[PDB]
Design an enzyme around this catalytic site. Structure first.
Site, mmCIF file in Angstrom:
data_model
loop_
_atom_site.group_PDB
_atom_site.id
_atom_site.type_symbol
_atom_site.label_atom_id
_atom_site.label_comp_id
_atom_site.label_asym_id
_atom_site.label_seq_id
_atom_site.Cartn_x
_atom_site.Cartn_y
_atom_site.Cartn_z
ATOM 1 N N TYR A 70 33.871 12.507 10.034
ATOM 2 C CA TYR A 70 35.077 13.309 10.148
ATOM 3 C C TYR A 70 35.064 14.035 11.490
ATOM 4 O O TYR A 70 34.166 14.853 11.744
ATOM 5 C CB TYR A 70 35.156 14.301 8.981
ATOM 6 C CG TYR A 70 36.439 15.109 9.006
ATOM 7 C CD1 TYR A 70 37.679 14.483 8.999
ATOM 8 C CD2 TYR A 70 36.412 16.490 8.974
ATOM 9 C CE1 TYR A 70 38.872 15.214 9.023
ATOM 10 C CE2 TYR A 70 37.591 17.232 8.962
ATOM 11 C CZ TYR A 70 38.815 16.589 9.009
ATOM 12 O OH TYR A 70 39.971 17.333 9.029
ATOM 13 N N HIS A 109 42.362 14.520 11.234
ATOM 14 C CA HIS A 109 43.726 14.980 11.028
ATOM 15 C C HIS A 109 44.339 15.328 12.370
ATOM 16 O O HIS A 109 43.676 15.904 13.229
ATOM 17 C CB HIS A 109 43.728 16.246 10.159
ATOM 18 C CG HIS A 109 43.419 15.965 8.727
ATOM 19 N ND1 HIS A 109 42.130 16.056 8.237
ATOM 20 C CD2 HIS A 109 44.256 15.667 7.714
ATOM 21 C CE1 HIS A 109 42.216 15.765 6.950
ATOM 22 N NE2 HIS A 109 43.471 15.479 6.606
HETATM 23 C C1 LIG Z 1 40.618 15.779 15.759
HETATM 24 C C2 LIG Z 1 41.436 16.411 16.849
HETATM 25 O O1 LIG Z 1 41.092 17.380 17.467
HETATM 26 S S1 LIG Z 1 43.045 15.690 17.021
HETATM 27 C C3 LIG Z 1 43.634 16.644 18.450
HETATM 28 C C4 LIG Z 1 43.122 16.019 19.737
HETATM 29 N N1 LIG Z 1 43.063 17.033 20.772
HETATM 30 C C5 LIG Z 1 44.149 17.551 21.336
HETATM 31 O O2 LIG Z 1 45.278 17.076 21.152
HETATM 32 C C6 LIG Z 1 43.921 18.727 22.246
HETATM 33 C C7 LIG Z 1 44.764 18.625 23.496
HETATM 34 N N2 LIG Z 1 44.631 17.334 24.151
HETATM 35 C C8 LIG Z 1 43.526 16.965 24.777
HETATM 36 O O3 LIG Z 1 42.505 17.649 24.799
HETATM 37 C C9 LIG Z 1 43.554 15.598 25.437
HETATM 38 O O4 LIG Z 1 44.911 15.284 25.796
HETATM 39 C C10 LIG Z 1 42.963 14.429 24.604
HETATM 40 C C11 LIG Z 1 41.635 14.838 23.940
HETATM 41 C C12 LIG Z 1 43.973 13.999 23.534
HETATM 42 C C13 LIG Z 1 42.699 13.238 25.524
HETATM 43 O O5 LIG Z 1 41.646 13.564 26.455
HETATM 44 P P1 LIG Z 1 41.648 13.076 27.933
HETATM 45 O O6 LIG Z 1 40.328 13.439 28.541
HETATM 46 O O7 LIG Z 1 42.872 13.567 28.658
HETATM 47 O O8 LIG Z 1 41.758 11.510 27.728
HETATM 48 P P2 LIG Z 1 41.287 10.326 28.676
HETATM 49 O O9 LIG Z 1 41.396 10.695 30.092
HETATM 50 O O10 LIG Z 1 39.938 9.864 28.206
HETATM 51 O O11 LIG Z 1 42.423 9.277 28.302
HETATM 52 C C14 LIG Z 1 42.096 7.937 27.908
HETATM 53 C C15 LIG Z 1 43.360 7.118 27.862
HETATM 54 O O12 LIG Z 1 44.269 7.654 26.871
HETATM 55 C C16 LIG Z 1 45.610 7.589 27.348
HETATM 56 N N3 LIG Z 1 46.148 8.944 27.494
HETATM 57 C C17 LIG Z 1 45.493 10.119 27.240
HETATM 58 N N4 LIG Z 1 46.253 11.185 27.318
HETATM 59 C C18 LIG Z 1 47.504 10.676 27.638
HETATM 60 C C19 LIG Z 1 48.769 11.287 27.805
HETATM 61 N N5 LIG Z 1 48.992 12.586 27.607
HETATM 62 N N6 LIG Z 1 49.821 10.489 28.113
HETATM 63 C C20 LIG Z 1 49.616 9.173 28.235
HETATM 64 N N7 LIG Z 1 48.479 8.484 28.077
HETATM 65 C C21 LIG Z 1 47.452 9.299 27.775
HETATM 66 C C22 LIG Z 1 45.575 6.800 28.654
HETATM 67 O O13 LIG Z 1 45.713 5.416 28.371
HETATM 68 C C23 LIG Z 1 44.173 7.143 29.143
HETATM 69 O O14 LIG Z 1 43.625 6.173 30.059
HETATM 70 P P3 LIG Z 1 44.136 6.054 31.562
HETATM 71 O O15 LIG Z 1 44.187 7.416 32.081
HETATM 72 O O16 LIG Z 1 43.141 5.240 32.242
HETATM 73 O O17 LIG Z 1 45.570 5.526 31.565
HETATM 74 C C1 LIG Z 2 34.395 20.278 5.384
HETATM 75 N N1 LIG Z 2 35.312 20.474 6.500
HETATM 76 C C2 LIG Z 2 35.113 21.478 7.390
HETATM 77 O O1 LIG Z 2 34.085 22.143 7.446
HETATM 78 C C3 LIG Z 2 36.219 21.782 8.279
HETATM 79 C C4 LIG Z 2 36.226 22.875 9.121
HETATM 80 S S1 LIG Z 2 37.692 22.881 10.013
HETATM 81 C C5 LIG Z 2 38.178 21.423 9.247
HETATM 82 C C6 LIG Z 2 39.479 20.778 9.548
HETATM 83 C C7 LIG Z 2 39.493 19.969 10.841
HETATM 84 C C8 LIG Z 2 40.967 19.919 11.176
HETATM 85 N N2 LIG Z 2 41.182 19.515 12.562
HETATM 86 C C9 LIG Z 2 42.450 19.304 13.017
HETATM 87 O O2 LIG Z 2 43.428 19.501 12.303
HETATM 88 C C10 LIG Z 2 42.502 18.832 14.461
HETATM 89 C C11 LIG Z 2 42.263 19.971 15.426
HETATM 90 C C12 LIG Z 2 43.432 20.920 15.514
HETATM 91 O O3 LIG Z 2 43.290 22.114 15.745
HETATM 92 N N3 LIG Z 2 44.654 20.346 15.334
HETATM 93 C C13 LIG Z 2 45.851 21.198 15.496
HETATM 94 C C14 LIG Z 2 44.872 18.997 15.138
HETATM 95 O O4 LIG Z 2 45.977 18.475 15.280
HETATM 96 N N4 LIG Z 2 43.802 18.253 14.731
HETATM 97 C C15 LIG Z 2 41.425 21.331 10.869
HETATM 98 N N5 LIG Z 2 40.580 21.720 9.755
HETATM 99 C C16 LIG Z 2 41.038 22.478 8.706
HETATM 100 O O5 LIG Z 2 40.512 22.411 7.600
HETATM 101 C C17 LIG Z 2 42.102 23.459 9.013
HETATM 102 C C18 LIG Z 2 41.899 24.380 10.001
HETATM 103 C C19 LIG Z 2 42.891 25.300 10.293
HETATM 104 C C20 LIG Z 2 44.083 25.275 9.602
HETATM 105 C C21 LIG Z 2 45.151 26.267 9.916
HETATM 106 N N6 LIG Z 2 46.452 26.104 9.616
HETATM 107 N N7 LIG Z 2 47.055 27.211 10.132
HETATM 108 N N8 LIG Z 2 46.107 27.983 10.692
HETATM 109 N N9 LIG Z 2 44.882 27.395 10.577
HETATM 110 C C22 LIG Z 2 44.282 24.342 8.626
HETATM 111 C C23 LIG Z 2 43.284 23.432 8.315
HETATM 112 N N10 LIG Z 2 37.330 20.979 8.348
#
Ligand SMILES: CC(=O)SCCNC(=O)CCNC(=O)[C@H](O)C(C)(C)COP(=O)(O)OP(=O)(O)OC[C@H]1O[C@@H](n2cnc3c(N)ncnc32)[C@H](O)[C@@H]1OP(=O)(O)O
Ligand SMILES: CNC(=O)c1csc([C@@H]2C[C@H](NC(=O)[C@@H]3CC(=O)N(C)C(=O)N3)CN2C(=O)c2ccc(-c3nnn[nH]3)cc2)n1
Length: 151
Positions: A70, A109
């Site tokens: 995850y 997520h």
């Molecule tokens: C579980 C989670 O946390 S889900 C939430 C994910 N995190 C976020 O959204 C936080 C804010 N966003 C970010 O931190 C970044 O935009 C990330 C993590 C989504 C991507 O990280 P980056 O370091 O910018 O990605 P990276 O440079 O490795 O991109 C790889 C490829 O993805 C694609 N890509 C990435 N971001 C973009 C963008 N905004 N627009 C278009 N293509 C993109 C491209 O194909 C890129 O390769 P290329 O540059 O050679 O064309």
């Molecule tokens: C056993 N599991 C654990 O220990 C564990 C710890 S945190 C976690 C998970 C991971 C999940 N990560 C994402 O959603 C990512 C990152 C991100 O920030 N965003 C926006 C996105 O799009 N993707 C959020 N989270 C929640 O449970 C969570 C956290 C905050 C809120 C909320 N709502 N309103 N205020 N706070 C709702 C749900 N799980």
């Protein structure tokens, strides 16, 4: 520039808390940061010329009779995006799952409005498998897709 990873340690967890506070729209509690120190290589900081600018935090999950990875948080500070840092972090965790071989899938997520993150993950084989209504409580939109890569 020098782009590489490093451990999350008790000595630098303060930097991780700041990176997550800056990058994400929701807050993570003390328990989250306690847990990150217990997952070994599943949590890492990313550095750009010796400064931490991104991080990935994951955990092993045993749900629905599977062993799953995850991804809780994965992100980069806005000034350092599109430099391959996200790719380096995600490939690090995919490498761990590959070495191991016992994970059924990797999932996460993502807020439904985050088109760029969805498309970033789709490049690695993640697909939307479900949409959870009202997953987020304080941000808009509240829905989250579940993205999963089958291993
Ligand atoms: C579980 C989670 O946390 S889900 C939430 C994910 N995190 C976020 O959204 C936080 C804010 N966003 C970010 O931190 C970044 O935009 C990330 C993590 C989504 C991507 O990280 P980056 O370091 O910018 O990605 P990276 O440079 O490795 O991109 C790889 C490829 O993805 C694609 N890509 C990435 N971001 C973009 C963008 N905004 N627009 C278009 N293509 C993109 C491209 O194909 C890129 O390769 P290329 O540059 O050679 O064309
Ligand atoms: C056993 N599991 C654990 O220990 C564990 C710890 S945190 C976690 C998970 C991971 C999940 N990560 C994402 O959603 C990512 C990152 C991100 O920030 N965003 C926006 C996105 O799009 N993707 C959020 N989270 C929640 O449970 C969570 C956290 C905050 C809120 C909320 N709502 N309103 N205020 N706070 C709702 C749900 N799980």
């Amino acid at each position: 520039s020098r782009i590489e990873l490093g451990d999350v340690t008790p000595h630098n967890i303060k930097q991780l808390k700041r990176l997550n506070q800056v990058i994400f729209p929701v807050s993570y509690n003390d328990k989250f940061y306690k847990d990150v120190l217990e997952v070994g290589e599943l949590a890492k900081l990313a550095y750009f010329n010796d400064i931490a600018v991104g991080a990935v935090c994951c955990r092993v999950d045993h749900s629905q009779n599977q062993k799953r990875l995850y991804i809780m948080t994965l992100g980069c500070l806005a000034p350092y995006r599109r430099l391959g840092i996200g790719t380096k972090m995600l490939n690090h965790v995919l490498n761990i799952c590959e070495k191991d071989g016992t994970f059924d899938n990797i999932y996460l997520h993502v807020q439904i409005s985050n088109e760029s993150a969805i498309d970033f993950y789709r490049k690695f084989g993640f697909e939307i498998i479900e949409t959870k209504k009202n997953y987020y409580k304080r941000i808009e939109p509240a829905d989250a897709h579940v993205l999963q890569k089958n291993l």
